[PDB]
Design a binder for these strands. Structure first.
Ligand SMILES: NCCC[C@H](N)C(=O)O
Ligand SMILES: [K+]
Ligand SMILES: [K+]
Ligand SMILES: [K+]
Ligand SMILES: [K+]
Ligand SMILES: [K+]
Ligand SMILES: [K+]
Ligand SMILES: [K+]
Ligand SMILES: [K+]
Ligand SMILES: [K+]
Ligand SMILES: [K+]
Ligand SMILES: [K+]
Ligand SMILES: [K+]
Ligand SMILES: [K+]
Ligand SMILES: [K+]
Ligand SMILES: [K+]
Ligand SMILES: [K+]
Ligand SMILES: [K+]
Ligand SMILES: [K+]
Ligand SMILES: [K+]
Ligand SMILES: [K+]
Ligand SMILES: [K+]
Ligand SMILES: [K+]
Ligand SMILES: [K+]
Ligand SMILES: [K+]
Ligand SMILES: [K+]
Ligand SMILES: [K+]
Ligand SMILES: [K+]
Ligand SMILES: [K+]
Ligand SMILES: [K+]
Ligand SMILES: [K+]
Ligand SMILES: [K+]
Ligand SMILES: [K+]
Ligand SMILES: [Mg+2]
Ligand SMILES: [Mg+2]
Ligand SMILES: [Mg+2]
Ligand SMILES: [Mg+2]
Ligand SMILES: [Mg+2]
Ligand SMILES: [Mg+2]
Ligand SMILES: [Mg+2]
Ligand SMILES: [Mg+2]
Ligand SMILES: [Mg+2]
Ligand SMILES: [Mg+2]
Ligand SMILES: [Mg+2]
Ligand SMILES: [Mg+2]
Ligand SMILES: [Mg+2]
Ligand SMILES: [Mg+2]
Ligand SMILES: [Mg+2]
Ligand SMILES: [Mg+2]
Ligand SMILES: [Mg+2]
Ligand SMILES: [Mg+2]
Ligand SMILES: [Mg+2]
Ligand SMILES: [Mg+2]
Ligand SMILES: [Mg+2]
Ligand SMILES: [Mg+2]
Ligand SMILES: [Mg+2]
Ligand SMILES: [Mg+2]
Ligand SMILES: [Mg+2]
Ligand SMILES: [Mg+2]
Ligand SMILES: [Mg+2]
Ligand SMILES: [Mg+2]
Ligand SMILES: [Mg+2]
Ligand SMILES: [Mg+2]
Ligand SMILES: [Mg+2]
Ligand SMILES: [Mg+2]
Ligand SMILES: [Mg+2]
Ligand SMILES: [Mg+2]
Ligand SMILES: [Mg+2]
Ligand SMILES: [Mg+2]
Ligand SMILES: [Mg+2]
Ligand SMILES: [Mg+2]
Ligand SMILES: [Mg+2]
Ligand SMILES: [Mg+2]
Ligand SMILES: [Mg+2]
Ligand SMILES: [Mg+2]
Ligand SMILES: [Mg+2]
Ligand SMILES: [Mg+2]
Ligand SMILES: [Mg+2]
Ligand SMILES: [Mg+2]
Ligand SMILES: [Mg+2]
Ligand SMILES: [Mg+2]
Ligand SMILES: [Mg+2]
Ligand SMILES: [Mg+2]
Ligand SMILES: [Mg+2]
Ligand SMILES: [Mg+2]
Ligand SMILES: [Mg+2]
Ligand SMILES: [Mg+2]
Ligand SMILES: [Mg+2]
Ligand SMILES: [Mg+2]
Ligand SMILES: [Mg+2]
Ligand SMILES: [Mg+2]
Ligand SMILES: [Mg+2]
Ligand SMILES: [Mg+2]
Ligand SMILES: [Mg+2]
Ligand SMILES: [Mg+2]
Ligand SMILES: [Mg+2]
Ligand SMILES: [Mg+2]
Ligand SMILES: [Mg+2]
Ligand SMILES: [Mg+2]
Ligand SMILES: [Mg+2]
Ligand SMILES: [Mg+2]
Ligand SMILES: [Mg+2]
Ligand SMILES: [Mg+2]
Ligand SMILES: [Mg+2]
Ligand SMILES: [Mg+2]
Ligand SMILES: [Mg+2]
Ligand SMILES: [Mg+2]
Ligand SMILES: [Mg+2]
Ligand SMILES: [Mg+2]
Ligand SMILES: [Mg+2]
Ligand SMILES: [Mg+2]
Ligand SMILES: [Mg+2]
Ligand SMILES: [Mg+2]
Ligand SMILES: [Mg+2]
Ligand SMILES: [Mg+2]
Ligand SMILES: [Mg+2]
Ligand SMILES: [Mg+2]
Ligand SMILES: [Mg+2]
Ligand SMILES: [Mg+2]
Ligand SMILES: [Mg+2]
Lengths: 34, 271, 46
RNA sequence: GCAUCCGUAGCUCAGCUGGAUAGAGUACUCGGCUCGGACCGAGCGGCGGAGGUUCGAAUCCUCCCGGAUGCACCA
RNA sequence: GCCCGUU
RNA sequence: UUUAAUGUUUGAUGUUCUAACGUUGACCCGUAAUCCGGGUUGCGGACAGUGUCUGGUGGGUAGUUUGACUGGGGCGGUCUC
RNA sequence: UUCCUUGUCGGGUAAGUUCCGACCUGCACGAAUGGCGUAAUGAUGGCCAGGCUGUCUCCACCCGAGACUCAGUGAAAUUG
RNA sequence: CGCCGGAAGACCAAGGGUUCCUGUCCAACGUUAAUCGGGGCAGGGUGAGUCGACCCCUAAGGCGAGGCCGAAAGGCGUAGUCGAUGGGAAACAGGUUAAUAUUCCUGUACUUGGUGUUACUGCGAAGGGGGGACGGAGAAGGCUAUGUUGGCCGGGCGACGGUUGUCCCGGUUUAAGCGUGUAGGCUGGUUUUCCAGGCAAAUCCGGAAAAUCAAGGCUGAGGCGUGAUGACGAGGCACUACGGUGCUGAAGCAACAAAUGCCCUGCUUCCAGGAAAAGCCUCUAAGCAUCAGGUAACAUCAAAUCGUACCCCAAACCGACACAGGUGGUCAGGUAGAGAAUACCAAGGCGCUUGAGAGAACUCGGGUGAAGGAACUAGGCAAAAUGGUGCCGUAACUUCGGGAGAAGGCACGCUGAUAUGUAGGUGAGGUCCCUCGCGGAUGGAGCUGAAAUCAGUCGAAGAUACCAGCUGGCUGCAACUGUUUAUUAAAAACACAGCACUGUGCAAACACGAAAGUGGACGUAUACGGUGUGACGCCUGCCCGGUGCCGGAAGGUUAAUUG
RNA sequence: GAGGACCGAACCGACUAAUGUUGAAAAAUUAGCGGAUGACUUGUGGCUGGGGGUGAAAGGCCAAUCAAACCGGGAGAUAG
């Protein structure tokens, strides 16, 4: 948790925004280097 | 009377129900009732201590006389009633002084029959008397283990106890499981068998019938993950282990009786 | 959709109110810590 | 493709006595009992190839060939 | 005790 | 080597007993009370049960270990003279 | 569940690595970590037919909401 | 003009807390402007014996004097005491404020206590008994809310052919209480004697016996009367700050239809067998006895305190937002319809806080399409298609229930006649009888009203819109209805009824607990726990060497201890 | 007039497609879809606490966090 953000005090868990594998549009076919 | 249902729906195709028309269609005797609320299998710590318990129909407790110590006074059987607390049926009896009591209903007992407890009672089904005055070889039920404590053995529907021997201050009983046990001869018993002996002939038919009785579903241990059960895990259906309980104790064969103070009363274990 | 905070004043006072804190020894140490920090509101009360 | 184990009488199998000597069952051959079996009495029948160590090899090395078993995974 | 068969 | 006799004496098993101890048997009282305690009695009884010590069992639970080289790791092979 | 394998034969199609029926050579089925059947049921897996169609051959036009222009308000990721 | 109208209307609980009303201001807040606002500032606004809380009573559960247990902290629990989401006294209609009203005013009521007077009298509990007091489903009858039509009363005679009529518009409302006791439901009544029961007592409850009577009692919607010579009332008249204010006021009846509401906590039926305690009624014990107390009438007094504005499917609550999300209860009009579906409307409420133009590609949401009709594609994905009621008709297979709405087909509008509106439903008057009233018989006026047949007629089309199954054949898996990865997996996975093995003799095994204890269970082997398999049908073969479990005790080995 | 019966609104759910993906929304909308008297659904209150709970079992859920929640402390853990 991010508990003392002054830029965005309303939100604590934010990696659904910028981390690609945690977005709701992430598909596992993007991880094909396997 | 055992009734097979007609298969008008898939939940009715296998239902076998036991119908006794001699039971009392009506409300039970109110001064012999008590509130009986459900537990869910949880103790005073709030934890589940017995699994697969929960829900079911609301039930009122009926105070059944297991002692039968109102001696010398005769009692007429008024009617047979349904009891949701046990597999046996119960009977409402009326004593000559105006006292009403619930007893367990024995086999072949109708409304109008005359019962009598006491040491000078007669040898006929329904009467309760101490086992020093019951003939050897008789079929009894509702048997005390301590004198004055109340009947504790052979209470379920269709069950009984044989008196095989009386030598000394003890009688030897053949229990329903096949165990030979010594009980002292001043303990009481009731002559006959317990009624409702086709209780085991019923078929619930569907899953919801078991949920009406307060039985919650059983999950197989082999269907779990290893963190939940010893049987858990596997890539597909794997077993590979010796069968155990959820706490690791060997089931399927291992004996768990550990009671050194009652071993002198047990003549022969069941087999 | 349905979120986690569903307010109820009775359940609020029974769970973290003043008499709920005063009933156990660990709740009384919550009030000692909040008095030592010098907070303007000790409990979730009226 | 790698690893491990095996090639011995017509067939199926022992023998590594740590290197100095090859056997069993069955088959086959001869004689007898009765025409043939079954049965009884006797006999015959050979270390996968090619080099090497060795006083000397079926046995120990090195390669070759054939037959089996296991492995060949992560992308 | 066992003791098959014969174009 | 081998036994019996007298005098003196432990261990084993068995049989009763009651008085420690048990009682989630009955009854009475504290008491307006299915707790608890006291009393009476019945049934068990030196057993059971508990403490210390001790052999066995013990993935139920815990702490950890599970080498390197390598034409990538694994598998195979190798590790000193 | 069968690697070899799209095994072989038959059916269905003009043409069928899938489907259905059979054969047995079961790499590596098999009897309550069940075997083989089975009416009914399934937002379950596979296959075929009739009807239907802009799914397609192969796109055309039309009705609205944006995109475009004017006036007002006015962001963002990124960036030696 | 458009949209909602089982809400996007109205009233609340929960939650919020002044957002309510009035005046004033437009910096910031409002996705634009703002003269407006749930914004800024100032003032105002919430009136109760009867509504709710508080209060009396308990459920789950909490706390818990002593107690039992535990290194300490503490754990459990008895007597008790708390704890609603449940039980317990009583008010309605009309009017009124800018903003509150079952609270204020007007009219008419009701309840529980205290005190006093009079009359009469066995009163009394921490005890006994009754009552309160209870499930699911189904069916029918009697009603009301409400609606429609007629009658009555007031108004109208029509912007364009017609409209003094079988024409058009509007109204036709009235409560609690008090009195009567009906449809319906339940039950025999009374008296006397006695008794191992209800911890003691009892005249009460329970039981037994006897006599006698053919009736009695309890419960109960609605209707009717009164309340009401009132209130309200379409409109009209008179003022006005054109917002509103003042006065008067006709008719105010009947028939039919009809609830998911009431009688009904009923009745019938089924198995899974369906709270507790107080208020209430009654009985007596200790006790008091010309007391106290009890009962009835009358008078008088009391009924405190807190909440009450406003929003409440939402711009005020939970979501950081004036955020297409989430949020329990109550009310339920018309036409068509089986309907709370759907379409259009009423009462009522809204047009969703950026607009104006233009009429490119392309994207989104839709409409139509020549000829062909799955050739598309991993795959008929998506679309298109089917769709109602009545009747005819319907295969294999089957556990005889099913399959099945299988498949497939025909009829369907309007007008007239049968019949100036039929069958059916409702039922006034008149007449008769008695029990003389909320009674019965006869009788049929009036109202309501399907379905069918025959004949005619219009269109391309009559279930015309909205609404509203695609069907068939073969096969794998799982019996089935269910359950699951909140946010990429709904399945063949999980569960399941059934089956089997095994443990368990009650202080049960087992589980949570250093323990006390609690669950198992106020159960007792036809019961309970664990494990595997998974409806049903036909079945389930051989192996005990290995590992495990059960039984055995001879011998070998073997701990602390002893020395 | 039985039924984990049938068709289908409220109500509960989430199978398919399209949109949206700096969204109107940190999981929705539109059009279809499943259950809909029951192993149903829902309001108010209560109980179970972290190697613990609960789980018709998916390592699911336990306040947008879960193969061991969150907060504070050991704590400036250690980091070839
Ligand atoms: N439990 C909910 C907390 C919500 C908080 N603003 C967050 O973003 O986590
Ligand atoms: K199971
Ligand atoms: K698995
Ligand atoms: K004793
Ligand atoms: K002992
Ligand atoms: K190298
Ligand atoms: K390389
Ligand atoms: K296979
Ligand atoms: K062909
Ligand atoms: K072919
Ligand atoms: K399915
Ligand atoms: K199928
Ligand atoms: K301005
Ligand atoms: K905005
Ligand atoms: K309440
Ligand atoms: K009383
Ligand atoms: K009672
Ligand atoms: K009596
Ligand atoms: K108010
Ligand atoms: K343009
Ligand atoms: K249909
Ligand atoms: K099967
Ligand atoms: K599904
Ligand atoms: K599952
Ligand atoms: K069992
Ligand atoms: K119990
Ligand atoms: K074996
Ligand atoms: K064995
Ligand atoms: K053995
Ligand atoms: K029905
Ligand atoms: K509930
Ligand atoms: K943890
Ligand atoms: K949290
Ligand atoms: Mg169980
Ligand atoms: Mg089971
Ligand atoms: Mg799993
Ligand atoms: Mg494990
Ligand atoms: Mg496997
Ligand atoms: Mg050679
Ligand atoms: Mg022959
Ligand atoms: Mg011959
Ligand atoms: Mg003894
Ligand atoms: Mg470990
Ligand atoms: Mg360490
Ligand atoms: Mg390495
Ligand atoms: Mg390598
Ligand atoms: Mg072929
Ligand atoms: Mg095939
Ligand atoms: Mg298999
Ligand atoms: Mg197998
Ligand atoms: Mg077997
Ligand atoms: Mg097996
Ligand atoms: Mg099969
Ligand atoms: Mg532009
Ligand atoms: Mg611009
Ligand atoms: Mg409209
Ligand atoms: Mg303000
Ligand atoms: Mg305002
Ligand atoms: Mg502005
Ligand atoms: Mg406003
Ligand atoms: Mg304001
Ligand atoms: Mg202000
Ligand atoms: Mg009150
Ligand atoms: Mg306590
Ligand atoms: Mg200490
Ligand atoms: Mg109380
Ligand atoms: Mg108001
Ligand atoms: Mg009472
Ligand atoms: Mg009425
Ligand atoms: Mg006039
Ligand atoms: Mg006129
Ligand atoms: Mg004209
Ligand atoms: Mg009480
Ligand atoms: Mg809000
Ligand atoms: Mg909000
Ligand atoms: Mg915030
Ligand atoms: Mg927040
Ligand atoms: Mg807006
Ligand atoms: Mg909103
Ligand atoms: Mg809702
Ligand atoms: Mg609608
Ligand atoms: Mg309107
Ligand atoms: Mg356009
Ligand atoms: Mg076309
Ligand atoms: Mg055309
Ligand atoms: Mg055409
Ligand atoms: Mg094709
Ligand atoms: Mg193609
Ligand atoms: Mg489709
Ligand atoms: Mg056919
Ligand atoms: Mg049929
Ligand atoms: Mg048939
Ligand atoms: Mg059909
Ligand atoms: Mg016609
Ligand atoms: Mg197949
Ligand atoms: Mg299934
Ligand atoms: Mg299903
Ligand atoms: Mg997921
Ligand atoms: Mg998911
Ligand atoms: Mg997820
Ligand atoms: Mg998906
Ligand atoms: Mg899904
Ligand atoms: Mg079990
Ligand atoms: Mg299985
Ligand atoms: Mg042993
Ligand atoms: Mg159903
Ligand atoms: Mg779900
Ligand atoms: Mg969906
Ligand atoms: Mg939808
Ligand atoms: Mg369907
Ligand atoms: Mg349905
Ligand atoms: Mg539905
Ligand atoms: Mg149910
Ligand atoms: Mg709740
Ligand atoms: Mg897994
Ligand atoms: Mg959080
Ligand atoms: Mg979470
Ligand atoms: Mg950890
Ligand atoms: Mg340190
Ligand atoms: Mg650091």
């Amino acid at each position: 948790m991010e508990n003392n953000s002054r830029t965005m005090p309303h939100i604590r868990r934010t990696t659904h925004i910028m981390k690609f594998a945690h977005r709701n549009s992430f598909d596992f076919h993007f991880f094909n280097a396997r | 009377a055992v009734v097979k249902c007609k298969p008008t729906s898939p939940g009715r195709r296998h239902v076998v129900k036991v119908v006794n028309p001699e039971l009392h269609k009506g409300k039970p005797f109110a001064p012999l009732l008590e509130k009986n609320s459900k537990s869910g299998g949880r103790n005073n710590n709030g934890r589940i201590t017995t699994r697969h318990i929960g829900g079911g129909h609301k039930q009122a407790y009926r105070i059944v006389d297991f002692k039968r110590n109102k001696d010398g006074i005769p009692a007429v059987v008024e009617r047979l009633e349904y009891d949701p607390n046990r597999s046996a049926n119960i009977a409402l009896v009326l004593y000559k002084d105006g006292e009403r009591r619930y007893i367990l209903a024995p086999k072949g007992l109708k409304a109008g029959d005359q019962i009598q407890s006491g040491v000078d009672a007669a040898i006929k089904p329904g009467n309760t008397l101490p086992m020093r005055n019951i003939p050897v070889g008789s079929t009894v039920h509702n048997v005390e283990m301590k004198p004055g404590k109340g009947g504790q053995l052979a209470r379920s529907a269709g069950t009984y106890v044989q008196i095989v021997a009386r030598d000394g201050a003890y009688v030897t009983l053949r229990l329903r499981s096949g165990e030979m046990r010594k009980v002292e001869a001043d303990c009481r018993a009731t002559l006959g068998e317990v009624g409702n002996a086709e209780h085991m002939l019923r078929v619930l038919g569907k899953a919801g019938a078991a949920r009406w009785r307060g039985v919650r579903p059983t999950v197989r241990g082999t269907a779990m993950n290893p963190v939940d059960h010893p049987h858990g895990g596997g890539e597909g259906r794997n077993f590979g282990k010796h069968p155990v309980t959820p706490w690791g104790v060997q089931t399927k064969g291992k004996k768990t009786r550990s009671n050194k103070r009652t071993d002198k009363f047990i003549v022969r274990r069941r087999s | 959709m349905k979120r986690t905070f569903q307010p109820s004043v009775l359940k609020r006072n029974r769970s973290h109110g003043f008499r709920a804190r005063m009933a156990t020894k660990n709740g009384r140490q919550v009030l000692a810590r909040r008095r030592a920090k010098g907070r303007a509101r000790l409990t979730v009360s009226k």
